[PDB]
Ligand binder design. Structure first.
Ligand SMILES: Nc1ncnc2c1ncn2[C@@H]1O[C@H](COP(=O)(O)OP(=O)(O)O)[C@@H](O)[C@H]1O
Ligand SMILES: [Mg+2]
Length: 323
C-alpha cells in the first residue's frame, strides 16, 4: 500500500576465482554507470551494479541499512541473495560471521540493531526473537531443533503467517545471535550426507523479530526482517543416476519459480499476488510486497563459462521493473 512493490534489485559480481582462471575463463562483464552491466552487448540496468571488489560494507549500506531502519520503525522487510552456486550468495548474506571487515549482511544487521537499541535504552523496552529454518524439496526443517522436520505454514487469528512449531529464540546480544546462526549451521549437517549438494539445493531463512514498547508513550512496534539465502538458481548440469547418454530432465526450483511469479505479480501492480505457490512465499507473505521493503541481491560470476547462467540471473532480477 506504500508504493506497491518496494522491490530493489542490486547485482553483485564477484572476482573470478582461481578455478575459473585456471580453466582459462575470461571476464565478460562490462560496466556502465553505477547501475548497468553489459553482457553479450545487451545492457541490464538495476538499482545498482557492484563490481568485483565492492566491499561488504558497501553492499550493506546500499542494500540493507535502510531496511533495518524500517524494521526498527516497525515495518517488515525481506532481503534475498539470488544466483547460481558459487556466485556469492552466502558470502553476501553472512560472509565471515566474526570478521569486522569480512562479515556479510546478517552480522552487520544484528550489529546495527543492538547498537540502535543501546542508543535508545531510555523509555523503550525491546524484545528480539530469532528463528532459523531451511526449505529443501518444499519441506521446512527447524535448524534450531532437528526433530522439527516437515513443518507446516499456518495463519494466525490476525492473518499473520507462521511456521507451526518453529523454534523462536529470544536473543539479547550480537554474540547470542551469532551463536544461534552457528548452531543452525552445525545442526544443518544432521541427516545430510553431502552438505555441498544440500547447501546449494536448499534455502536458508533467518528471521529477526524486533518488538519494542515505549513505557511512557505506550505505542508498541513490531517488525520482522527475513534474511534469505536461496538455493542455487542453476538447475542445469545435474549429475548422477538417470538416462546416461540421454538427460535434460530438471525443473527450476519450486520456491524460486514461486518467488519469480510473486515478484512479477507485484511488479505488474496486480491486486492478487500468488503467495500460495510455495511454502516460502506463503511464510514471507507479510514481509514481501505490500508495505514492505524488499532487496534482492542477485550475485553473478563474471566468467565466460557462466555466461548463460548469468543471463538467467540478470533476467530474474529484471522481473522487478523499476522506475
Ligand atoms: N565478492 C567476493 N569476494 C571474494 N570472494 C568471493 C566473493 N563472493 C564469493 N566469493 C567466494 O567464492 C566462494 C563461493 O561463494 P559463496 O558465497 O559460498 O557461493 P554461493 O553463491 O554458492 O553461496 C567462497 O569462498 C566465497 O567467499
Ligand atoms: Mg551457499
Amino acid at each position: 500500500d506504500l508504493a506497491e512493490c518496494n522491490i530493489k534489485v542490486m547485482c553483485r559480481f564477484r572476482p573470478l576465482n582461481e578455478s575459473e582462471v585456471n580453466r582459462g575463463d575470461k571476464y565478460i562483464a562490462k560496466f556502465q554507470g553505477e547501475d548497468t552491466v553489459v553482457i553479450a552487448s545487451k545492457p541490464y540496468a538495476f538499482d545498482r551494479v557492484f563490481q568485483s571488489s565492492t566491499s561488504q560494507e558497501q553492499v550493506y549500506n546500499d542494500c540493507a541499512k535502510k531496511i533495518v531502519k524500517d524494521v526498527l520503525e516497525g515495518y517488515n522487510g525481506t532481503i534475498f541473495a539470488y544466483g547460481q552456486t558459487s556466485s556469492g550468495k552466502t558470502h553476501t548474506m553472512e560472509g565471515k560471521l566474526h570478521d569486522p571487515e569480512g562479515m556479510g549482511i546478517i552480522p552487520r544487521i544484528v550489529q546495527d540493531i543492538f547498537n540502535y537499541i543501546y542508543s535508545m535504552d531510555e523509555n523503550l523496552e525491546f524484545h528480539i526473537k530469532v528463528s532459523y529454518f531451511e526449505i529443501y524439496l518444499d519441506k521446512i526443517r527447524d535448524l534450531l531443533d532437528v526433530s522439527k522436520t516437515n513443518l507446516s505454514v499456518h495463519e494466525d487469528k490476525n492473518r499473520v503467517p507462521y511456521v507451526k512449531g518453529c523454534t523462536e529464540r529470544f536473543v539479547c546480544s550480537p554474540d547470542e545471535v551469532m551463536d544461534t546462526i552457528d548452531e543452525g549451521k552445525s545442526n544443518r549437517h544432521v541427516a545430510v550426507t553431502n552438505m555441498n549438494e544440500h547447501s546449494s539445493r536448499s534455502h536458508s531463512i533467518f528471521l529477526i523479530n524486533v518488538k519494542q514498547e515505549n513505557t511512557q508513550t505506550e505505542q508498541k512496534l513490531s517488525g520482522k526482517l527475513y534474511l534469505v539465502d536461496l538455493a542455487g538458481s542453476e538447475k542445469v548440469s545435474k549429475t548422477g543416476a538417470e538416462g546416461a547418454v540421454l538427460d535434460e530432465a530438471k525443473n527450476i526450483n519450486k520456491s524460486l519459480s514461486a518467488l519469480g511469479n510473486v515478484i512479477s505479480a507485484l511488479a505488474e501492480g496486480s491486486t492478487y499476488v500468488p503467495y500460495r505457490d510455495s511454502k516460502m512465499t506463503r511464510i514471507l507473505q507479510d514481509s514481501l510486497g505490500g508495505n514492505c521493503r524488499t532487496t534482492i541481491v542477485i550475485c553473478c560470476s563474471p566468467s565466460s563459462y557462466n555466461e548463460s547462467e548469468t543471463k538467467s540471473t540478470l533476467l530474474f532480477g529484471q522481473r522487478a521493473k523499476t522506475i
